[PDB]
Design an enzyme around this catalytic site. Structure first.
Site, PDB file in Angstrom:
ATOM      1  N   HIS A  35     -23.225  78.999 -31.896  1.00 19.87           N
ATOM      2  CA  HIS A  35     -24.088  79.023 -33.073  1.00 19.87           C
ATOM      3  C   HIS A  35     -25.576  79.248 -32.771  1.00 19.87           C
ATOM      4  CE1 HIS A  35     -24.674  74.621 -32.254  1.00 19.87           C
ATOM      5  NE2 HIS A  35     -25.871  74.885 -32.746  1.00 19.87           N
ATOM      6  N   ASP A  57     -17.213  76.240 -30.388  1.00 22.63           N
ATOM      7  CA  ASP A  57     -18.651  76.465 -30.500  1.00 22.63           C
ATOM      8  C   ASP A  57     -19.282  76.743 -29.136  1.00 22.63           C
ATOM      9  OD1 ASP A  57     -21.138  76.639 -31.605  1.00 22.63           O
ATOM     10  OD2 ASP A  57     -21.010  74.678 -32.617  1.00 22.63           O
ATOM     11  N   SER A 109     -29.547  71.715 -28.827  1.00 16.78           N
ATOM     12  CA  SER A 109     -28.201  72.232 -28.631  1.00 16.78           C
ATOM     13  C   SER A 109     -28.083  72.810 -27.214  1.00 16.78           C
ATOM     14  CB  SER A 109     -27.882  73.331 -29.650  1.00 16.78           C
ATOM     15  OG  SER A 109     -27.172  72.801 -30.752  1.00 16.78           O
TER      16      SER A 109
END
Length: 158
Positions: A35, A57, A109
């Site tokens: 993402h 992901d 992230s």
């Protein structure tokens, strides 16, 4: 104690260059959250053919033979207690990794969570605030090497 370490954590940047996440060298692969749509700020790594894994992901590439030594080591054994990451302590209790509310956000992230021996226990993808804390959505692998993805209700991707 000079903190002299290999090059394992790299920045992923957006079109104008804002750091929007992180990519890491671990167990022979460069991996970053799918993402996170940006580029890995690295002359060699940003030219590799990445393989997508939408279910988890994750997005990974094979580390150049050279860099393979400059990597993190994974560990599937995480007893309850405290762990460490960039911002401080991460607590692992009740099958969940939590941090204090108002601490994690965009840019976090791809950051690893780690134990005192320096092994990566999990990778952060986002967080879901619950009361005075935030439950992290992380990627972890079990003893038989199976990728697992834990995503709390209301998780927002960082």
């Amino acid at each position: 104690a000079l903190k002299l370490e290999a090059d394992r954590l790299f920045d992923v940047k957006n079109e104008d260059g804002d750091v929007i996440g992180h990519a890491l060298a671990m167990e022979g692969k460069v991996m970053k959250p799918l993402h996170v749509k940006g580029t890995i700020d690295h002359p060699v790594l940003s030219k590799l053919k990445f393989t997508k894994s939408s279910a988890y992901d994750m997005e990974f590439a094979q580390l150049p033979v050279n860099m393979r030594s400059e990597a993190f080591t994974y560990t599937s054994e995480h007893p309850e207690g405290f762990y460490k990451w960039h911002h401080g302590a991460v607590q692992y209790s009740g099958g969940r990794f939590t941090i204090p509310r108002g601490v994690g956000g965009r840019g976090d992230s791809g950051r690893p969570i780690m134990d005192n021996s320096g092994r990566v226990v999990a990778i952060v993808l986002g967080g879901a605030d619950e009361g005075t804390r935030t439950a992290l959505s992380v990627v972890t692998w079990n003893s038989k090497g199976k990728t697992i993805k834990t995503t709390p209700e209301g998780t927002e991707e960082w």
